[PDB]
Symmetry: D3
Subunit: 149 residues, 6 copies
Amino acid sequence: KERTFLMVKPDGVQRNLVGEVVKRFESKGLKLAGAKLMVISKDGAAAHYAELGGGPFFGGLVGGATSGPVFAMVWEGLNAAATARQILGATNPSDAAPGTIRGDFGVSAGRNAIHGSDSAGSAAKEIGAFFGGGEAASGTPAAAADIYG
Amino acid sequence: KERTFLMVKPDGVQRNLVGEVVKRFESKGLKLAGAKLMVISKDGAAAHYAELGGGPFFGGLVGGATSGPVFAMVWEGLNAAATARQILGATNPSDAAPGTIRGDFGVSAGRNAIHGSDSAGSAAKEIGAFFGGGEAASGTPAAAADIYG
Amino acid sequence: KERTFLMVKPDGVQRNLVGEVVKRFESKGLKLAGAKLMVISKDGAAAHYAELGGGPFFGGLVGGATSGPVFAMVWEGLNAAATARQILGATNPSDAAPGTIRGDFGVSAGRNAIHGSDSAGSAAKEIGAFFGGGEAASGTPAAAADIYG
Amino acid sequence: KERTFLMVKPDGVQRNLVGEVVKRFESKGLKLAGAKLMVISKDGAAAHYAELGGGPFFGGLVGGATSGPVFAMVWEGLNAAATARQILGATNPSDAAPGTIRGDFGVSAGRNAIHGSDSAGSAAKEIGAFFGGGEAASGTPAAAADIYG
Amino acid sequence: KERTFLMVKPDGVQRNLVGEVVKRFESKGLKLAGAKLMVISKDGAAAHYAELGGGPFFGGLVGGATSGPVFAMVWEGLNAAATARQILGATNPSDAAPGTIRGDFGVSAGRNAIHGSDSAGSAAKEIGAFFGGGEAASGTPAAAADIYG
Amino acid sequence: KERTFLMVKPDGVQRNLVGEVVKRFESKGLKLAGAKLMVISKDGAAAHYAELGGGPFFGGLVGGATSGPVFAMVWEGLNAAATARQILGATNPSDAAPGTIRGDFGVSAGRNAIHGSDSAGSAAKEIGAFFGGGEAASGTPAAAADIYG
């Protein structure tokens, strides 16, 4: 059903947390509709982080995402985006509820393992910028009935 | 260093084993140079499974990979391909050493979670068919020194 | 000490979460006094879900529990029932604290992995309906001293 | 399909390994057709361990199983029994392949976490003695197609 | 950076939770600057628990820590102490957020797996009493850059 | 019972594998009689690696252990040393059975997570060099009866 864009920032990829962060959502019910390693290459960054470019963080923020790769993803299911952030954790890892990808694998707001949509609109603008339309498989997960109803 | 192509067959994707199977190699040292959900779409299959197309299995084998998506990947490091198959497990999951992706998550030779190169040549022909050349990030993993020397 | 009835609804059994959901309480301290796979068989349902039978959910709720099996259990220890629900999670999995059997393995209020008593009375009426009196082992766990005092 | 009897000896129940040992087979594909906590109560022992009652071990062997409870189970699937012992591990835990329930959770041949059939006949005589015929659910696991074919 | 004293009380050591409790902080980013098994030996206790010695708990509290060993540790990083207690969990395990060392491995306020500083001062007085000054390695963790910035 | 010296080489400490590597033996039955972070400081190295100092590896081998810290340990139980190496894994991680600390967390013979005695004599000479005699707790693990007999 509803889709959501969420990727693993350079740090997590480097901290070998790719697998777990993917898995967390698999064993949750969220469905992986597309995912790859497309780097930010600066240009892709500035736009994505376009909001508040005048803020000092940009200088040191756009520096980060652009270093190592970025495993980008798109996940399905009802309330996929709503629930994602809940388990993604609070933005600040040193303030994020223990049990989340952040409160379990993150000690700094600078580079906190993953990233994920803050609304369906932000979701419907992130998928596009990073993915496309064909890179996404429209596979029906053989196990989805034992989740919704 | 050496690269290797290895993907999660439709079954594992469906059995929610995407994360673990990725993670296994992260916590091993293997480096994820590119990865996405590009389906087999028949044509991509027949070629990949080209070997022994005259064998009856093809009828029922090419049927499998083509159902659900396929998380394809390319991994780095020394002896990446050599070691991969070792931990990938024996082909038959009901005969594969307990500790592997197969002997831990597989009961049938038909659909056994993942797939992975059987030699550097087979590796240097699988990467190409499924990936390309640009989809691969040439990121230097900040943690590779604590592995090799 | 205090006992509590808590089972894994059809969904979790089907979602292969039997082991983890059992284990969660083992590594917590709760003691497994009896457990099996006794299906609801409709009659057993209607009574258990007797409360608010006039509510529309019953139509579609009693349909659920009755499909696949149900691993029923009874757990011991002080505050067993009080603490259980806390770690069982909120009723709604898309609203349940990340770290629980629900917020980690559930995306719908319809079928949320497990079920567990809401009070000592409800506990002292669920055990009976599903278990009996002899199916329960009165074993003294050799490791209980390192928990209470 | 084929069924198999396998229980967790008193030790494992006490060592809180109930959950994991159950889970191992869930994430493998084996299907839990019935399971409870029926103690050995001596009589049930002597018969089960009937073979080589004249051997000194019986004195100290029948003493063991009869202490704490015993989570008995019956598992399904093709080659269920054949494969089970493989992942159950070698009889001697201080000689059992690392990755198994024994080589991971056992240091003595005396009490090694679990027990499991040594042949289909031994399987078709253990189920009966410990279970019955009605305690077993004939549920069709909604996820079995993504395993066999 | 900032250091913090936190040990595993006798119970956890006995409950085999040493590894996990250590690991939790490793995969968090906290750095292990020194750690061993120095028992409380009464004298070391009374001082550490000096606060409220007139309270009845002391009788039964100092009895506890002094039984089995105690894996003491000192951890590094920014907000190490601040964040530690958050993931250490609430003092009462039957009231501590599920995801913590306490809410996951503890059912009694008496003996709750681990112990950890309640302020930088309390941290700068616990390290000393249990460690020294030379037992601490001043190693620079080759992976710290992918955490802070 | 029998004791054994086994530490985590600089690499593993750096690769955040301290916890797991400790835990592996806890959930096995091995008892932690003492453990800390005492660095090799060259002198401690040369002696320990004294054997084959004339071999070229020494140049580049003694360089390794001396970089980051080293969590040294001493473990108890029957066949502690015999069984340890089995689960420690083969010396070469790219040849070590999948399920071990090496075959799961190691890709190079140079730096392979941990180290552990090759005989009771080598065990009775490693403990001494790294530990002492007082740093070891003679605690009786409250859970040892459910293992041996």
